[PDB]
Amino acid sequence: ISADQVNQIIYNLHHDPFEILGCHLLEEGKNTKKWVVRAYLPKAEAAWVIRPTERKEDPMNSVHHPNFFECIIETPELNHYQLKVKEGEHEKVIYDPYAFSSPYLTDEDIYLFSEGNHHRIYEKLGAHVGEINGVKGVYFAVWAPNARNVSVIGDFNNWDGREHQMRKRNYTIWELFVPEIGSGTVYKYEIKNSEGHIYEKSDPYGFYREVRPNTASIVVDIDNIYQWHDEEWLEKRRNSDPLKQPVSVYEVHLGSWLHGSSAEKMPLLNGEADPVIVSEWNPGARFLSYYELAEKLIPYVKDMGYTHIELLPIAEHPFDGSWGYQVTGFYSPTSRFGRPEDFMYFVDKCHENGIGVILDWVPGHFPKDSHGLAYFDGTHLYEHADPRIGEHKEWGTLVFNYGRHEVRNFLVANVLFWFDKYHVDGIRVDAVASMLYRNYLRKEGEWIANEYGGDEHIEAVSFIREVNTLLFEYFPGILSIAEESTEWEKVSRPVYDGGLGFNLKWDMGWMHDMLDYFNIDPYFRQYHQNNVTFSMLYYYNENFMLALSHDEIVHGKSNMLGKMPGDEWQKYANVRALFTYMYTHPGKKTMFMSMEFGQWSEWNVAGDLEWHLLQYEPHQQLKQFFTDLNALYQQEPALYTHDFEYHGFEWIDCNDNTHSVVSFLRRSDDPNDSLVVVCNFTPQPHSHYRIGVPEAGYYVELFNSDAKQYGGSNMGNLGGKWADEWSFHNKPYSLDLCLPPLAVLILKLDPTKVP
Template structure:
């Protein structure tokens, strides 16, 4: 069923033949690898359709699905649920998972709808679900199956990815199986996604009352290995694409999109975005149509393309932005309480704690020509990224390449920076140690010469 976007699977061991045969997919994966591109497959072990040519009533009995419809059917989706308590069903799914790694050489799975698997009452009203043997809502056999498949995948294919689309507070999703976790190595941060989209859809004036949307995710970011995801689910079903979600005129819409993604790339967590967001296009994603590539003939969309090129380079070139994504030591607020201006500032640190970058985010169209923040070390801070750069379609406000610190105590730091914050802009600054050292040495030499002259 094309309208399911591939989420109602009947052939579990090959991609749809509409795009070619299995050998064609193998060739595609090999070419991706030759060009440094990993391939992650969306795997759907949570449910399957009722089509007669699929697994439903495979031999005339409930062979793959649970016979009790309270556990074996998702009525809202019109699909059936695997009977995870049967060894044969689990072995079928485990062999299917390993097959994709062994035969197709894929680099990872994104496992769809994990919450629908591990909760017996998922999308089921009272009276239409049955509790487990302990009276709880947890589908224990499904959780055990996920532990089994993740344990085997990482045992056979270490270094791969298994990403959970899990939308609840189920604990220890990305913890190892030997301590009771589900064994994934990444989990989609659905809370961050909802908070940020709600925040950016507001008129900027109202954002001062919702600073918590920006800051709340930091309270729990280290409890799991999170991935920040802006996926296909956010640009369908009349939700509008990213540009359409944003308030203001066209310039503000583009600036808001740049601010959202720049904050995403500086926030702890791995990154996922859906095709079409990188230009970005105006229309929703249409499974039957093409992306709106023609928009790239316009300067505003070309500017966004350059923005994403540069923000990807920023991310990959700065270990502080990725090495400690899941550790508390990798993130530190400078100031998260300036809700009156809708500004936050923070530090991201690499494993080498002396390697850090400073991010300052202004989420309103009001620029600030003198905005002071405390910083941990004295010296010259280079502005290594500015989402408001003219090259991206911004107003080109900034700090002329960087700023020297002042010996002015601020935000509990002895040194501080007096910055120009652009409208709806994100700044990333980094201490230029070589320039700072050279100027300090020159200053010391000048002082020594002065003292010598004075003594003479």
């Protein structure tokens, strides 16, 4: 490029910056092409072009002016890149703002989609505000290759689509531009199939939707509705390894945490809307908006000390009672709680408070509702045609055809979509087994084997691997969490080593061992010490997340207190012991709303949590307990640096089954950060109980779950204990501890203490 062309851009004289900024082809070689990418980045000193899917990074050079950058790259195609931009001491990573010159689909868009590789297909499919033939309007496009016809129906044409019939491109995708309508436009697609039958669909790539049980899509100007402030949070995440950090997740179902009064409007970010009544059964109650949740859930979680909030599925879904796990609007956050910009504000505000957001994401199935993806164009489009792999009969739902390019693309791009447009920090996928197995919940003679005679769902495995491969390339630093309940191997290992590419897996065996264990009468736990210890045997085969989830406090399983034997005092003490053990045991942590304050009743999604319990001391003390434990977790490196290395853990002794006592060490990089953890899982106190420790010195009683401020009896070691030079548990020194009833102690050598 020339200085004259550069100055035209710098001083805003150029007639069309897309001519020059973005990606342009310079020449074709035999096996490759030469491209240039150009950017104008005022205030940046430096920049790079990242090609995350090839694992490459090329620097940009300033050309004629210090904020005008060029990068020449040779590669056969340059579809997938990002710009890294350094301003002062800060870097951000973004998509090229000059990537797309027009709102319509190009040949290249269509070709990439046909192959299932269009990582940004949602910039073109769906509905977007733009300009064509010099007029402002909305471009619509939808994949429906077997339709006989499609028209856009909406408010703007009184649901009559005769003058808005769409044009079919390449036998596959229908499009139409509609002048002078914009955001807020309510619309559907009217489709005629090959039999002549006419019906209506919501937009598969819709960015907003009417409030259930209405289903019309709504047009969103998704890049011009919200201003973010979380650059520093994103930089920190991209440059860190969350596996080496504390991760304590508060799991939350947004629709049932807290309700408000349906006799007022639902406030939104700089506006308001009609209330969304939680149900006809409870009509005085409404849902809180994303905006109100940002103002109330977030400081609550911050004060509790959790690092992350994990949301039950917020993609648009027609029935409250699915909890979100049956989705029909994969590209829009549910309108139950307001608008897209309200949820953006919610994420932006978590990031400001130092809190990550993890989304339960549901690529495993979708329900049959006629507004949604089913039988979309008069054929089995999204779902596989053979019901032996295309329906989950026991659930009444349909299974995506993962092997079909455009279907894979829908989902792969959908996952990237929440990271791109909504800045989320992770996903969690429920029931991965449902995808992995061709015989899932299917009886003999009702499924067929793969091409090698096995039960592995090859297409699904390949899809899962591509999702995880792409996520971590484009957004390093995220959490990808699996619950997989059949001991499939290498769930949380790299795809290159034969894994599925997740970086965490729920430890369901651990959950079952713990809840079965605490449910047993204390005198009988002696027969079941293996429940305490067994999961350390397989622990190092995955990176484990220790989750006590929503699923474990419904359907007659009781809430946590109710699972526990004994009198009221003992029930609380059992909860404190269980969770102190959870937080000290290796692995990341997840717990569900209501567990942190001892709700007696089961989670019931038709109401909100029983907040009134927090008027009473026991519930308050338990909440203080979790607040303190979370703070401890963040303060003590040995609780999080080495979760997944042998170094990080060692049993001291775990054979005293007769008193249901176990003890262990946690370690970090600095030997002085080592912790000694001692657990007493019966109500019998012990005034003298010797535990081997690795070093002489004073061991501070850093934490005690029987402290009175937690509702305990306040028994313990009055600050700490000097180790005796007295070999025990194969260790040269030892502590003669007082062990409180149904309680866990954490101790720490203070090497600077005065003897």
